[PDB]
Amino acid sequence: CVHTGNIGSKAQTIGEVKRASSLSECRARCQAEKECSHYTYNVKSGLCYPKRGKPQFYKYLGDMTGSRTC
Ligand SMILES: CC(=O)N[C@@H]1[C@@H](O[C@@H]2O[C@H](CO)[C@H](O)[C@H](O)[C@H]2O)[C@H](O)[C@@H](CO)O[C@H]1O
């Protein structure tokens, strides 16, 4: 499972990109979204990214994409 890394997902977000208290907070949000197959928690700004579809991983120090679960 993917969690901690420097790989951001250049994929379409389900809704508005809101910030989260922590990574687990983003996971909880991704658990609320039934279409959220993976979330990218930008620890650099603290933004939660509940995305769907195919994820386009790119190199960025601060973007941590999690495989939803795990
Ligand atoms: C912060 C930034 O400039 N990010 C660029 C990406 O743009 C958005 O980045 C946020 C978090 O970094 C989310 O990933 C959002 O979905 C992105 O659209 C941009 O897509 C990528 C392209 O390689 O570069 C980042 O630097």
Swiss-Prot record:
Q: What happens without the gene?
A: Reduced production of IL12 in host cells during infection.
Domain (Apple) ranges: 1-70
- Mod. after translation: Proteolytically cleaved at the N- and C-terminus after release from the microneme.
Q: Which domain of life is it from?
A: Eukaryota
In the record, the effect of residue 51 to M is given as: Reduces binding to asialofetuin, a host glycoprotein, and ability to activate host bone marrow-derived macrophages and dendritic cells
Note the SS bond partners: 1-70, 26-48, 30-36
**Where does it localize?**
Cytoplasmic vesicle, Secretory vesicle, Microneme; Host early endosome
Q: What's noted about domains in the record?
A: The first and second apple domains are sufficient for targeting the protein to the micronemes.
Quaternary structure and interacting proteins, as annotated:
Monomer. Part of the MIC6-MIC1-MIC4 complex. Interacts (via the second apple domain) directly with MIC1 (via the beta-finger region). Interacts with murine TLR2; the interaction promotes activation of bone marrow-derived dendritic cells and macrophages in the host. Interacts with murine TLR4; the interaction promotes activation of bone marrow-derived dendritic cells and macrophages in the host.
This protein is called what? Micronemal protein 4
Native source species: Toxoplasma gondii
Q: Which gene encodes it?
A: MIC4
First-to-last residue of the parent protein present:
419 to 488 of 580
